[PDB]
Amino acid sequence: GMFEKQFNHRTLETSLGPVEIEGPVTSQILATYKLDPGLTAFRQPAEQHEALVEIAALEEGRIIIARQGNDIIGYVTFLYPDPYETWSEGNNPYILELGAIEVAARFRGQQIGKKLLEVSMLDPAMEHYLILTTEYYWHWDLKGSGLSVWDYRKIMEKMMNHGGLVFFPTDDPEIASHPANCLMARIGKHVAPEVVAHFDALRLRRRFMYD
Template identity: 60%
Template structure:
């Protein structure tokens, strides 16, 4: 499958200043920006900066960033599902995972996450993909936000809805291990039925075991 990436951008005015939301960017471009020290959700900022620069150059990889002047203050990643996760077993070239979305505390509540997803979906090529994201409550910044799991889940779901992702049922053990965890999916308009059926079989792998 040919991975077409079309650059899009928009300006977002916030009480903290105007930011640019843009992408998908090349690894070189991502590396050329500063990376805010508060982007610590997944690993140390310098390591995460390097990781997303590398994802940007993968054939299917997509990095959309939100930057204030020359500093990345938020980003979202899209790439093939982790080989260790059940989603990779579908062996679908037209399925990518929204792997990480992060915004620094200073810009939270300014609709940055929502805009990162909207800019991601401006690219018409996204209509060729099944896009999934797995939400686990243990990745959420409950301490930093002061929200409980259900309040955070509601905000997360609303943000994903802005990118056209909707809640889908699954029997995946990790997702099923806590009721706040969830699978969210966006099926592009040009995705064929066979791909959808293969994806559905992966969503429910235990249905014939009873």
């Protein structure tokens, strides 16, 4: 939150491209764009657009977008973990959540996710955060992607790996409920051991049973 947001930009060529990959984008500017109709994995586009704008308005919030003209065909979000999920416990401002990352189905296979993550990490400020993320099978567009759950998981994980995120075991009930779900996290080069220890305490939450 206390850090400044460095705007970065790269043009990604695609079979439909080129696509402008840039951010963090301000709320004022995000409101002028239009979410592509095919970005409905979390909620309908009108509601999800309002959600991206709101996130951008947060002190720590960052919205990086994949864009063609006024049309957002993909995005990736960053903000502090949800107050009503386990990842927000304690007073640790060095823990940031990669909320979500979504890309219109027709743009799949053009490595937009990879770049979306690249441009997100171009800001040296990201090295000061431990960036965790959660992925659940029930938000994945398997029907549209044609992928089984495990092929999807393998592809999605390697995408996240390109952004520096790595899989971490957890005893979190929701994630643990299905092996395909996962917690991943990117530990910035400048992140202190205390922050990492806190993260370990969050993901292995029932340690007290064994203390």
